[PDB]
Give the backbone structure.
Amino acid sequence: YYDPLINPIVLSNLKATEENLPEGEEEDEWELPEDVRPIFEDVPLYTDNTANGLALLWAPRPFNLRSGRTRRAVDVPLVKSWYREHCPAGMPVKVRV
Amino acid sequence: TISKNNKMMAHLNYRMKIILQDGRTFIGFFKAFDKHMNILLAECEEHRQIEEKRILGLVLVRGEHIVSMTVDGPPPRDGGAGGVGQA
Amino acid sequence: AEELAAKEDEEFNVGPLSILTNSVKNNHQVLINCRNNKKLLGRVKAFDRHCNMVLENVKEMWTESVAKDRFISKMFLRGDSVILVVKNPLAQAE
Amino acid sequence: MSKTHPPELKKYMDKEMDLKLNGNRRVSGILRGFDPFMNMVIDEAVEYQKDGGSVNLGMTVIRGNSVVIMEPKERIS
Amino acid sequence: QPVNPKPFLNSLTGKFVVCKLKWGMEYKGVLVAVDSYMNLQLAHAEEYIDGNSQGNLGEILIRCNNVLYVGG
Amino acid sequence: WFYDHKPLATTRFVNGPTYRKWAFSIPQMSTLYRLANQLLTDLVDDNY
Amino acid sequence: VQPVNLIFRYLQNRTRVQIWLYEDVTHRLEGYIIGFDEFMNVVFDEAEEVNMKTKGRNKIGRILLKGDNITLIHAAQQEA
Amino acid sequence: KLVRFLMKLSHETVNIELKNGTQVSGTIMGVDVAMNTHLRAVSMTVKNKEPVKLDTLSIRGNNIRYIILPDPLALDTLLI
Amino acid sequence: PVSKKKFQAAERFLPETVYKKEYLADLMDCPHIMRNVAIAGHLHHGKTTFLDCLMEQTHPEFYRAEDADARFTDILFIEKQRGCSIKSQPVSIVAQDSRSKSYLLNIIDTPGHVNFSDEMTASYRLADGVVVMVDAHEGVMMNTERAIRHAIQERLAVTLCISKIDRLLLELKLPPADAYFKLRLIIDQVNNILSTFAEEDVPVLSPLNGNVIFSSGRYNVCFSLLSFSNIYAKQHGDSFNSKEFARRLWGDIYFEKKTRKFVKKSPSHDAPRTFVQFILEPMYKIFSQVVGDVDTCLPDVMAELGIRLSKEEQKMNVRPLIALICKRFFGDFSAFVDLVVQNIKSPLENAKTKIEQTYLGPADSQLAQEMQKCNAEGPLMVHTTKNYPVDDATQFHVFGRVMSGTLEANTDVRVLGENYSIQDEEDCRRMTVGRLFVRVASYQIEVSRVPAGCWVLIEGIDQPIVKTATIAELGYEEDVYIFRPLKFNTRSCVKLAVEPINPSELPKMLDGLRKVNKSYPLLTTRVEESGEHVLL
Amino acid sequence: MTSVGVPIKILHEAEGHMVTLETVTGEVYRGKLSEAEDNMNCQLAETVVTFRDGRSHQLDNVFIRGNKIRFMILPDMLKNA
Ligand SMILES: Nc1nc2c(ncn2[C@@H]2O[C@H](COP(=O)(O)OP(=O)(O)OP(=O)(O)O)[C@@H](O)[C@H]2O)c(=O)[nH]1
């Protein structure tokens, strides 16, 4: 969907490129054979999983994976992202240190 | 021979003598063919009846003109793992 | 596959190839005029859209000129050389 | 039946072309049409005779398989 | 107005025709049948070479490729 | 299956009792991603 | 112009055309086209056979000239 | 179609005349859907030339004019 | 003793390639085939990763990680660590167009940072043609304009490649219709640059013009219109003339499924065009099925794509699985080979244009005609503008383009510095050529001779070559002139002064200055009248 | 393209180079194959025609119909391709 935070696709002064489409009279007769069809015609463009699957692509690791080798419980360092990123602005002396 | 895949892959690269409908004899290492029976001869030579030999390059013969072809000569020619023991 | 064979059989019952159809089933000799200016007189046992024929008890005659001939017990003739198939008036249904 | 891609000849269109045909006829003129069989259309066509004579033709259609060699008089466009 | 070959030969089918082969010989007879490939079957057919008849052949089949022209 | 000891180990989502490889779908991955949330960062990290 | 559309002009205009035969270099056919098919067989009308080695002529009338035998078809010159 | 009869004639001995007048005799080791015939233990008698013995010979099928078939051949069983 | 001087990757052996080296070396004798190209970009557009796809196709042994770009043409360890490209590197590869005719390509991966843009100048001197890489989200930023503009001024032939298209579907999530408009606007931006800066008839960059292609080097996607039409033609089986469909796959045109004709008025209020239906929606459906479903859809993806995935490939994640699905379905980049082959013109046609721009000498009778012929039998002339250092940094090899005659290893040659003229002539030396190599960034193929039109890496002549150099036949009795210096697209504005704590070591520092001066080209070394040693 | 046979693929790789082809009428044409087709129509440039009597002439461009070509001598590097 076109998220309104995405700025519109327009530049007001921009000259539109010439499109060398085929000229009508003979070329309009040209027809695509009756069984030629978009590669995924009837597969829907998106499902109710798709929104979640796209969100997972930029989940923090490990959640951007879906297949993985398994890891020991001692190795998952559950809080480690918290101290890597930064102190919150409000936390006092003890915690900052 | 040809098209029978187990057999065709062995009949390529033979040195074959090709007879054409104009009466020419070509000789070369036959190493590609086509459904139209076009043939591609590497290191080719021609013999013209009168006999005289001329050296050609890689020669593509359009299949329409072949009468017949025959084997002239063989393709060119040239376990391995162990080491457990000591002596 | 079999639809093309069915198509091939249907054309023989009506087309110009009826003469080959009659030659087989009534065993009537055809004097096939052929390229290289040679005549083959014999009975067709099978033929096709390409006008191949398998021939039995062939007499081959031609002008060399002087006449020469050869007897061929059985033959397959590639129909590309056939000019003109004459349902032979010098023979009859057998 | 078979499907054949249109020949490359579009770069030769409306340029002056010589042709050598079966039976060693020499034909010349402005090539301005072809088809997948290379049935040429030669406009303002001219015949060159094997005795050295020449005769103007009309707008001319040539059956493709009679064409042996075709040869521009001018650079390809 | 067009007179296309298959209508033309159908209009000749069952009628007398002259058939010329590509190699200097002519067969005149009743065109009994024609097919999509335009093989020709002639009946009561007679062989003409250099403008002269030289014999009745009866029913003859002329294979498609041999024909230069055929007509009434 | 969430609170089993070795979850899924006897199922097609993990190679077997040695418990060395896993391959979850998206319905599974998005659900546990959502449960994990309280521990996870907000970031599209690398530039921050 | 294509080729088939050009032969349609001979058909529609009934233009007197001269046909060159294939390997038969010493004969040409003159007449009017009255029809053709996808194989370029020509149903040919008022057809004459011209022996250019002598300029002798024979008149044949309406014929099917098989398209296999055609080298060239062109609008006839003023010769008759 | 009748070409599928010939490929049942594997290992039969035949005498072949080609369109060029070459006479070839030998045993069909195999012949294909285009009647390209592959022969073993082959003699080629090119026209007005002495016969030459050959081990193998592949003939492009359109060059075949006719194949003389062996006399015992059970035509009534192969033509089904 | 085993000093860990290693500052760049260098391959311990010649890696395997799909083409034979002998066919590459033979094709070098035939400039009527070969092309030279430079790839030029804003920082971190597709450019390096796209060449890794060309590497992966030709090589087979070329490992690309599922996590991160291999960036084969970014050989230096500073470039590995920084991950921007910092210096140009050349590739030479044999690659097939849509006809499966085999072309020889030489390609420089120019760095996208403007500070490095001096590297783009040296590359464009070699290039003949440029491919410009635009990022489907960012579009034409700063260096993209500078790359196009500077390529025009060189008189390169300019071609466009729109790159990281996947950003439209995955990150921006623009639908199909708006994704087409975003691509359309990028093309319009570039043509707006071309029409203002060219003033001459530099050719308009539509897809209908097929001088434009679309790519995602992360996902092995690269297609023009014709390669996508060939996919429909192969898939359905030549039921239509594929070039006639390709003409209709872009712009304001629509497919009327009632009639199967193509119409230019929107057949409904909502109708997707051609590009949206045929090109974009299958791409969105490839990604969205693997992104959303993976577990369930993947057998159906095998059926319509006819691709096979083994069960351990079906357990790949999304990025490697989509990249594998696209790799098998699209196959090689040949749409890009079409782009290069048709638009760029070879050495031979371009050699007239390139000698007029580069040469400085009297651009008329004797020597300039031998170069404009690009005749491999003519008198030797080589132009060089790069210096690459050997793995011990003891010496440089110079990188060169030949177009007169043939350059031969272990022969003697006349090397002309940037000042040489009939008055300056002391600025020339006779050098003995060492080995000659063809360079494929990390690895070098060694050859006895290189003929006009090729690029070459030359051993042993590096001592007098300060930056650019001309190399010329000794026996040529007529006047030889040097090719121009590099007319850089920027200036060295920042001055830095260098002084060692060690000053008895100052002679070692000056040798450091000479070596960097050779490596950089735009870096200017001064010794001021104050005695300061200065870098610019 | 569709999988046309190897001889036609080699013919398109021959487009860069000089080829020498003989026509069914006997004339030998040497020139630089500028376009070829899957029906093996050939366009030659910078051509020299050699007649069957041994006379020769230069020709700037030649188009030869594919079914009138007897054979072509291709260059050796194509054996590597
Ligand atoms: N999302 C997305 N990112 C990509 C894609 N291709 C490349 N990138 C990313 O962009 C960054 C730069 O890629 P490079 O190949 O190094 O780009 P680059 O332009 O060669 O870098 P420089 O030439 O030095 O400017 C890396 O993080 C890549 O992962 C893509 O197709 N999709």
